[PDB]
């Protein structure tokens, strides 16, 4: 065991949630542009 383990665990979960958020943002952008096109039609 090591002293900053609790702090280290925080940074790992932080990067995990950040990566998931960026992927979800990408998918949402795709869907929104599709909304724009279908509304125009």
């Amino acid at each position: 065991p090591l002293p900053m383990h609790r702090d280290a665990r925080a940074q790992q979960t932080a990067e995990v949630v950040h990566a998931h958020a960026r992927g979800a943002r990408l998918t949402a952008a795709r869907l929104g542009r599709a909304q724009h096109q279908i509304n125009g039609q």
Binding site: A10, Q11, A14, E15, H18
Partner: protein
């Protein structure tokens, strides 16, 4: 009918809004109790735009005062116009942010966002048809810079169609009061460009200059700027509250001021600023107001507009005048300063008139203007951010909250592509 819900964030936002709630109480003839003591019927016909009704002929502001530090609102509630605010509309936390944008936007703001969303939902449903919201805050703080960006981030999806003006405070480079100012500035302007129908950039230096030269005040207190700030804020919605020869409102300016949705940053101005050595020698004429306005010393932003091109110009006149001197002066200012206006939009100037003058005065004028010279401010902040971000200094405050690093990289990307598109609109062939 066309109501306004007044947002209020940060210590800076707290004091100017308190001053702003003071002056429009004076205009509407509202005592510190809350009752109406005015004389004219025209002082109480459209008072519902800012106030809400309370029992006993009482008028309470439709305001939401937000701050993370408990100390500020005690000064708010201890002022002369201190007790008019509803105690429930006060919302606050137990700890501040300590000049960290990250604390107010990610860690501490996320607890209090629930409470403010109810009380703004409260003030949304009270009015039958809300014209829109309006926010006052500072980009160099911890809460208004932080949580304040989170409030406008949420109400857009929930309330899309409503207008959102921001009475923001841009920090200054020549005098600065916070070391980590460049970070919170850039982590806010990336938010601002994406949710704001129209932005007013108020910088603390230019009023501090305007108090020396134009008004000749020996000891400028913070209240004097809060008067001068709120003075121009009154001139924005004056045509909304009172009838005039040519009526207007926020939206009549908003669609007329924004040629592209990426451009909503203007530079305000207020006309009747005279020292006590000037009042005995002046004739109150519209030509004097127009020449006072288009002078570059009068402004409360920090970018000389002669370095850029005026995209659009808005002038709101307060009082009863003839339309000849009006229509003939913007035509006169348009043709003489032909080099300072873009060529692809003829008649760049838009005008509105409210017949009712402000109290204690005869004539007045308010100017809103989007010019290319406002890009001189944003690049100067990026001149400091990269100079400090390149050495990864002070970062442990920000990455300690758990954020990644691409947030910085995308934040500088947004402003760089903002000024890049801002620059292209300066050199355009007909």
């Amino acid at each position: 009918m066309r109501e306004i819900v007044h947002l209020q964030a940060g210590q800076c936002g707290n004091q100017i809004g308190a001053k702003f709630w003071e002056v429009i109480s004076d205009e509407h003839g509202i005592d510190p109790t809350g009752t109406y003591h005015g004389d004219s019927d025209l002082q109480l016909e459209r008072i519902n735009v800012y106030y809400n009704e309370a029992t006993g002929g009482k008028y309470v502001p439709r305001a939401v005062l937000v701050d993370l530090e408990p100390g500020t609102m005690d000064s708010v509630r201890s002022g002369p116009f201190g007790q008019i605010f509803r105690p429930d509309n006060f919302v606050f936390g137990q700890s501040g942010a300590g000049n960290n944008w990250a604390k107010g936007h990610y860690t501490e703001g996320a607890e209090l966002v629930d409470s403010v969303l109810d009380v703004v939902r409260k003030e949304a449903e009270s009015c039958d048809c809300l014209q829109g919201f309006q926010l006052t805050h500072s980009l160099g703080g911890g809460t208004g810079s932080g949580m304040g960006t989170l409030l406008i981030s949420k109400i857009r999806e929930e309330y899309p169609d409503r207008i959102m003006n921001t009475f923001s405070v841009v920090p200054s480079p020549k005098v600065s009061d916070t070391v980590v100012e460049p970070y919170n500035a850039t982590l806010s302007v990336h938010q601002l460009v994406e949710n704001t129908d129209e932005t007013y950039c108020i910088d603390n230096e230019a009023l501090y200059d305007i108090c020396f030269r134009t008004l000749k005040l020996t000891t400028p207190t913070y209240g004097d700027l809060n008067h001068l700030v709120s003075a121009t804020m009154s001139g924005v919605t004056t045509c909304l509250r009172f009838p005039g020869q040519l009526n207007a409102d926020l939206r009549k300016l908003a669609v007329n001021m924004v040629p592209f949705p990426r451009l909503h940053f203007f530079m305000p101005g207020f006309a009747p600023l005279t020292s006590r050595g000037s009042q005995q020698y002046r004739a109150l004429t519209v030509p004097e107001l127009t020449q006072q306005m288009f002078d570059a010393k009068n402004m409360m932003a920090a970018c000389d507009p002669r370095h850029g091109r005026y995209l659009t110009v808005a002038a709101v006149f307060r009082g009863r005048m003839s339309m000849k001197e009006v229509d003939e002066q913007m035509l006169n200012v348009q043709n003489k300063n032909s080099s300072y206006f873009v060529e692809w939009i003829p008649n760049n100037v838009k005008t509105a008139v409210c017949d009712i003058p402000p109290r204690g005065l005869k004539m007045s004028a308010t100017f809103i203007g989007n010019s290319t010279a406002i890009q001189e401010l944003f690049k100067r902040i990026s001149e400091q951010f990269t100079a400090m971000f390149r050495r990864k200094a002070f970062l442990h405050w920000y990455t300690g909250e758990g954020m990644d690093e691409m947030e910085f990289t995308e934040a500088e990307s947004n402003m760089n592509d903002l000024v890049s598109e801002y620059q292209q609109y300066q050199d355009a062939t007909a």
